[PDB]
Design a protein around this ligand. Structure first.
Ligand code: HEM
Ligand SMILES: [Xe]
Ligand SMILES: [Xe]
Ligand SMILES: [Xe]
Ligand SMILES: [Xe]
Length: 154
């Protein structure tokens, strides 16, 4: 699939607002993911112990990881489809070391969309959400193709 420049503009415009507070958005997204789909938390031996939303919000370690996640995603989105080089090490670590199924990438995509919708209603109307969804679908499609080459695809 290919996004139009108009679609990338909608994605990068709302992303510019996300970058004003990377740590805060990273925290919101990861917490939303763990509350909505508790099973995903089991993949993080680093955070499995967190029992409540309050503990999650208080974790400095969780906030640091959210920044790492958003920084990696932001670098990919800014390539506007030319992300082959950036995707390789991510696909390798998530397929071979972390063992993250495609299903879980769908869950975090949903979490990202929910958070942007709540925090940026004026910059995340239907058209902007559709463009972000297309961008995340492209990301997942390419990661899935990589998983298959690496011998995981699941
Ligand atoms: C938007 C998608 C995601 C991005 C861009 C992303 C990015 C990253 C980055 C940059 C790292 C550190 C380097 C590495 O290990 O590759 C990482 C580590 C990791 N990721 Fe992801 N990730 C994503 C989704 C997920 C999901 C959905 C899960 C599981 C539910 C997951 C589980 C992990 C785990 C277990 C680690 C290691 C954490 C640690 O112990 O330090 N990731 N991820
Ligand atoms: Xe995140
Ligand atoms: Xe990933
Ligand atoms: Xe994603
Ligand atoms: Xe992408």
């Amino acid at each position: 699939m290919v996004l139009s420049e108009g679609e990338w503009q909608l994605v990068l415009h709302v992303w510019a607002k996300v970058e004003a507070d990377v740590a805060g958005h990273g925290q919101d997204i990861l917490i939303r993911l763990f509350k909505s789909h508790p099973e995903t938390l089991e993949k993080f031996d680093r955070f499995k112990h967190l029992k409540t939303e309050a503990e999650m919000k208080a974790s400095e370690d969780l906030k640091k990881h959210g920044v790492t996640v958003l920084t990696a995603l932001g670098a990919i989105l800014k390539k506007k489809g030319h992300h082959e080089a950036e995707l390789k090490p991510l696909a390798q670590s998530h397929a071979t070391k972390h063992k993250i199924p495609i299903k879980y990438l769908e869950f975090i995509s949903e979490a990202i969309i929910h958070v942007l919708h709540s925090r940026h209603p004026g910059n995340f109307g239907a058209d902007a959400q559709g463009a972000m969804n297309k961008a995340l679908e492209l990301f997942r499609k390419d990661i899935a193709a990589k998983y298959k080459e690496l011998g995981y695809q699941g």
